[PDB]
Structure formats: C-alpha cells, structure tokens
Design a protein around this ligand. Structure first.
Ligand SMILES: [Pt+2]
Ligand SMILES: [Pt+2]
Ligand SMILES: [Pt+2]
Ligand SMILES: [Pt+2]
Ligand SMILES: [Pt+2]
Ligand SMILES: [Pt+2]
Lengths: 311, 310
C-alpha cells in the first residue's frame, strides 16, 4: 500500500485502470484533457484531446483484432475514441444530446459500451461499432429527463437515474423501475430526495445519494427498503458529515465506503456491520475501485493535491 | 413561560405535580430524600424519608375519604407512602425484590415496575394499609431487563413493548431489537426508557438518538426519527432523554428541544440551548381546567424547572 502524488493542482474527474497504469480525465480545465499515469514509475503525461471537460472514461478492449481503445465522454456530449498504442488513431462516435455522465463496459457473449447522459438517456454501442467514426448506438433508452442525470451503472444490469433504480437485460428493455424518493422507514427524508450517485449490486441493492450520509439497501424482488446504513453513527463509534462519496465491494462480504472526509469504512454484509475503519486516510475520498485483486483509492487535499493510494 | 431555579447542586430523579406545587425525588444523595416545591412562592423544602435513593414518585388520590398519598419507590425496593396533609401519617407497602423503577397511576390502580422485570398492581384503597400486598405480580422480564416506563396500558421492559388492559394477562409482547436492520444496530439494542402512545408507539432507548415508531396491530416498525439529522438543519449527540405528546416534544441529551408533527413527521419547532441538558418533560393539571407543561433541565449543577401553559 503506497501513495502516488499527482502533479500539484491536478483534479481527477474520473479514472480507469489497465507496468500497470491508469487513464485520467482532468477536472482542473474546461477543455478535454486526458492524462496517463504509470503506476510503476509514477510518471504523469497529459494531452488536450477534446473541447469540453472529460466526465467519465471507459476502456473497450477487442481481443480479436488485438486492439484497446480509450473512450472519453465529455461535457458537450462527445464520445472521443483514441487508440492506446497509436494516439494518431482517434475518432468520434455519434454526438449525445447532452453531457456524457456514465461509461460502462458490459458483456452478455457480446460486449457493449453503455453511455449514460445527463438528460436521462442510455445509449448502447456494440463492441466492434466503437471502432467506426460517427458510429450510431444500437439503441437509446429514454429513462429520465433533463433533470434526472443517469450517473451510475453496475452489474443483468442495474443503474441509477435521478431517484430511480432501473434494471435491464439482453433485450435492453427496462424491466425493473424502483422509486427511492419515498419510504416511511427513512431515518431522514431530505437525504433520500437526492440523485443516486453510485449503485453496487449484491444480494440486495446498496445505493448512495448526493450529499447523503445514508446508504440505502433495497430489495430486487419486493422493490422496498431492506435497510439503512448511517455512516454518521458508524463514524461516531464527532462532527463528521459522513457524506458518502463512493461505494466499493470486496469479494463477496465486504463493502468499502468512502465518505466526504478522509474516512474509509469497511463493513460486513452477512450478519454484522463493522469490520474496519480508517480515519483521515485523506482530506476527501473521491474515487474507490477494484482493478486486476488491487484496490485503488483517489483522494484530494486542499491549492489542491490529488493522491492515488494503491494496495 | 417562567423558570424556577432549584437550589444549587439539587438533582431531580423523579417528579410529580399536585394542586400549585410539585414533589421531587432527590438524586444528589444516596438516601431517600423527598422535596417539595411551591410553584407560586418558589419555596423549597426537603426531608430524608428513606434509606435508599427515591427512584420514582406517584400521587394516589382517593376522592372518597378525601385523601392524597405520595408514594416513593426507592433503590432498595421500598414503597414509602406518606400523607399529603399530615406528614406523620406514613407507612410502607410490601418490599419489592429489586429496585422500583416505575410508578404509574391508572377502579383505580397503582402499577409498580421493578428493575428485575416485574410489575406489581395495587388497588386504589390498599395503598392506605401498612404492609399491604399487591393484587398481582406479573413477571414480564428478568433481572437484566428493567421495567422503566408505562403509559389499555403500554409499557417498556428491556427491549420489549408489552401491553395489558385488565391486569391479569400480558396482551402484546413485541421485540424492538428487530429494528437492527434500520439506521443503526447498537441504538436498537438498548433498554426502552420512555413510551408515548397516540396512534403508533413512539419509543426511545437509552443512549440512543433514534426515536422508533412501531405499529400497534402489525407489531412492526412504522418509522424512525433521527434527532442528530434533524438537529443538523454540528457535534450534537442528539441522545433522547424524554418524549411528550401535545405534536411530539423531544428533549435531547443537550439543551435542545424538538417539536415535530405526527401526521406528517415534519419539523414544527426547534429550541436550541434551552438548557445544558433536558431531563424531564411532562404535562400536569395544576387545578381545575389548568393544563400545564413542565420541563426539568440542569446546567457545579443548577437544575431549573420551566413552566408554561398549553
Ligand atoms: Pt468515472
Ligand atoms: Pt458507477
Ligand atoms: Pt468497485
Ligand atoms: Pt418517575
Ligand atoms: Pt414513563
Ligand atoms: Pt407526557
């Protein structure tokens, strides 16, 4: 477990991993800047590639044809595809009607690129179609509206749009649609009336909402509230906000929770709750993900100093 | 609303009002000290009446025979009955096997809940008799589950809510630990300290900032009220110390008082720093057509009694 310091004032909007290295979208700029970090040598290189800020990233790998493409979704709705080996090979897919707020690589075996936009729409591209300039999506699901950004996808596929949890399968039709804005058992009502920022899929659905310290647990079948995890009370065992910023699952039982501060919780999901707690791991946990085995945690301190801890 | 400052370092464990004046059990002493406060003149008098700390008070009024008796249940299990008019008229009922942790006035009856999970029932008249035995003793819990609140009659014993109407059968028995699935586990695994009954059961647990709301019929959780989150709209503990219906009043471990709506579970009023710690909050009848709200808090200790009209 070592910490790699990014250059000063670098802000990381988004992250994808692949001498291990990671691709980063820069948030300290209004244009689209793509950065590359060698996890071994801690070397950092960047390049302005788009006109608007890069919101999320995805890595589409084609085993046949032996080619890896890095896909950047931008604030203007542009999907910029760049070749990993030869940067001179780059093109653009079909422009989205709003900003690209989610990029996911799914498999059904057929591979797909799911693209969630800020106007509540979900575009689906096929694995091969990513290579084609101006390529059109196979389908576009109108799940929400301009006020309900589609911000997270997890794997059947579950996703978060506004205050709704949606599900879809092979045929790409929305099967389950669960409204999480209202529940009588809510410990506090104002927290639940916020957009869902992350969804992790296990036996139940564990969701977190913007500026909310309460991780909600909903059932797939009954579509009702299974439970509540109040990070404020777990942290107090005192002025912590407990605002959840990221959720990450370990192999089967453990769930990682990054809070608005630099606190990281590790909870068991079978019969008890609390396993491990690390206070002041940073000033603010921003991203937390698993890569191939390996845990990556991107935080920032504030001038701004972004750091990437890995173990 | 007016405040009455009690003498310095006076600690009030229990409280009961009569017509205006109030009776207090003292908690700043290891013996059983009973105090009397005139709400008009703010005069304070006290007397050591028992060997162990007076834990709970009750006021048994007999309209026929025209007699008021003050009953004190203590840490040793003694039930001391004293005449309101003549202090020399005092006696002791049957000793309880553990400390008396609840006294309620409900034909009229006196319910006596003890720390070993038992509930003894006395009739209205039998309080006058020296060494009188209870009509019945219900063994609801054990030595580890104290019966600490009563409000058909509902009550709290350990982590269970019990119900009874005609004094010889425990009707409902609901386990409230089951709420571990919602908003915290350690808070739900605590003894019930207060229960208020309007349409659902609003219960609070020791060292818990979460008021649970349970259904009478389905015997399941209706809702949760997290005082920490309501207070933050920052280091407040939010530990609930008292509940009282009017709307629902909630006194917290701090000096904060919440006033919430029942039908909507919305926030009506919030009074920050009403004192340093709210301890007791109740309604009293200080005379004919006189409904009054009493709040006992404390702030090196200075206990204060705020009083206003409803
Ligand atoms: Pt991302
Ligand atoms: Pt996500
Ligand atoms: Pt993850
Ligand atoms: Pt009492
Ligand atoms: Pt009570
Ligand atoms: Pt009350």
């Amino acid at each position: 477990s070592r910490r790699i310091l990014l250059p000063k004032n670098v802000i990381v909007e988004c992250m994808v991993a692949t001498n291990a290295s990671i691709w980063l979208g820069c948030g300290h700029t209004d244009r689209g800047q793509l950065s590359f970090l060698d996890l071994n040598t801690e070397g950092y290189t960047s390049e302005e590639v788009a006109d608007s800020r890069i919101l999320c990233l995805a890595l589409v790998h084609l085993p046949v044809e032996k080619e890896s493409w890095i896909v950047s979704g931008t604030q203007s709705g542009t999907l910029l595809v760049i070749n990993t080996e030869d940067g001179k090979k780059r093109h653009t897919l079909e422009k989205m009607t709003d900003s690209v707020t989610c990029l996911y690589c799914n498999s059904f075996q057929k591979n797909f690129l799911l693209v969630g936009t800020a106007d509540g729409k979900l575009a689906i591209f096929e694995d091969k179609t990513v290579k084609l300039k101006g390529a059109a999506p196979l389908k576009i699901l109108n799940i929400g509206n301009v006020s309900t950004p589609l911000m997270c996808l997890s794997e059947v596929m579950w996703g978060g749009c506004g205050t709704k949890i949606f599900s879809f399968s092979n045929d790409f039709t929305i099967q389950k649609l669960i409204e999480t804005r209202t529940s009588q058992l809510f410990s506090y009502a104002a927290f639940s009336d916020s957009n869902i920022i992350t969804v992790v899929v296990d036996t139940a659905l564990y969701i977190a909402k913007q500026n909310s310290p309460v991780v909600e647990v909903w059932d797939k079948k009954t579509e009702k509230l299974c439970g509540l995890i109040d990070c404020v009370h777990f942290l107090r065992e005192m002025s912590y906000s407990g605002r959840v910023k990221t959720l990450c699952l370990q192999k089967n039982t453990a769930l990682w929770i990054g809070t608005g501060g630099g606190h990281i919780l590790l909870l068991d999901l079978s019969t008890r709750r609390l396993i491990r707690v690390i206070y002041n791991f940073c000033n603010s946990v921003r991203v937390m993900m698993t890569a191939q085995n390996v845990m990556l945690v991107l935080g920032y301190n504030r001038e701004i100093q972004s750091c990437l801890t890995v173990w």
